[PDB]
Ligand SMILES: Nc1nc2c(ncn2[C@@H]2O[C@H](COP(=O)(O)O[C@H]3[C@@H](O)[C@H](n4ccc(=O)[nH]c4=O)O[C@@H]3CO)[C@H]3CC(O)(O)C[C@H]32)c(=O)[nH]1
């Protein structure tokens with residue numbers, strides 16, 4: 577068990593840098609621990625201790641408690657909005673002040689960790705949405721993988737009619753809504769104001785709610801989409817690439833990965849970038865900061881990124897990772913890794929506002945759930961979301 581190995585490594589160590597994370601298990605937790613085990617073996621008496629804090633929401637709550645208690649870890653995973661929050665307290669070390677080189681990091685990811693021109697995060701486990709699909713079920717009914725939103729809706733209705741059940745499965749949540757919202761031309765910031773109830777928002781939430789009414793979209797209310805597989809016909813989901821190993825272990829059918837359907841065939845749709853960056857807390861000792869420096873250099877190395885990305889379905893964050901022989905050997909055997917990289921070229925972020933975590937779950941996610949599960953009118957549900965968000969900001 578890698579967490580037992582690390583516990584023993586850290587027991588023999590003169591300096592331990594704690595890294596608080598939101599991996600509850602599967603391949604992401606095993607890949608993070610395996611990376612830490614190798615880092616720790618290369619050091620002389622210096623270690624990283626990964627500390628599971630629950631999911632990402634539990635992690636952000638535990639960091640809030642840590643600020644209140646006046647005792648932060650050395651490193652933590654952080655979404656771009658969590659970075660914005662922690663910078664209000666000036667709790668974060670600039671990454672380049674540690675002497676970590678970021679050249680060769682993808683500008684999609686590096687730009688998202690740059691605040692006021694300075695980098696306060698190291699992109700580590702960055703995901704993109706992809707189209708997961710049931711190759712067997714599409715083959716059975718001769719339905720090509722849809723390249724456009726129009727094709728996707730047609731494919732879902734045709735397969736749902738043939739199978740007697742809704743085949744597009746989705747979580748009624750902010751992540752899923754972002755795919756439809758972005759690819760209907762939606763934009764969350766209008767002259768720097770956060771807008772949740774634009775016509776593209778209403779259109780995105782109407783399309784999902786109509787999908788449920790018309791019997792081609794199946795809301796998943798309990799667990800992850802990959803935990804629900806096997807109950808009723810499944811053709812498609814739009815989901816994080818970090819879901820890849822979880823789909824593979826659950827799927828009784830031949831799992832497919834495609835680029836996202838876009839407005840036209842001239843370009844794939846935009847996917848939502850999720851997963852986290854590593855931040856380094858100012859409060860850490862110079863000795864713990866020096867361990868963070870080396871760990872970050874290690875996490876950005878082409879081998880570390882190649883192994884982590886091939887073990888998980890996360891997007892390798894560097895140019896050098898794609899040139900690493902381990903990455904190349906996996907990609908040559910499994911086209912899904914190249915599909916994830918291609919889709920990572922067409923990448924949108926949610927707003928990096930300090931309040932965004934509360935807004936995306938408690939306000940926006942609640943409005944999506946009202947409309948999908950309680951048949952609330954999409955505009956009325958999003959107008960309420962807008963009022964609650966305007967009150968919070
Ligand atoms: N706190 C906070 N969370 C945020 C923010 N923006 C987006 N997200 C959440 O990031 C999750 C995606 O990040 P990612 O690392 O791509 O995927 C996660 C897991 O989602 C995924 N997983 C785990 C178990 C499983 O059976 N299936 C599976 O796919 O594996 C990875 C590690 O757990 C989304 C999903 C959500 O958690 O419901 C809400 C979303 C934010 O601003 N703050």
Ligand SMILES: O=S([O-])[O-]
Nearest residue numbers: 684920921922923
């Ligand atoms: O972001 S570039 O790959 O179009």
Ligand SMILES: [Cl-]
Nearest residue numbers: 631632633634
């Ligand atoms: Cl959580």
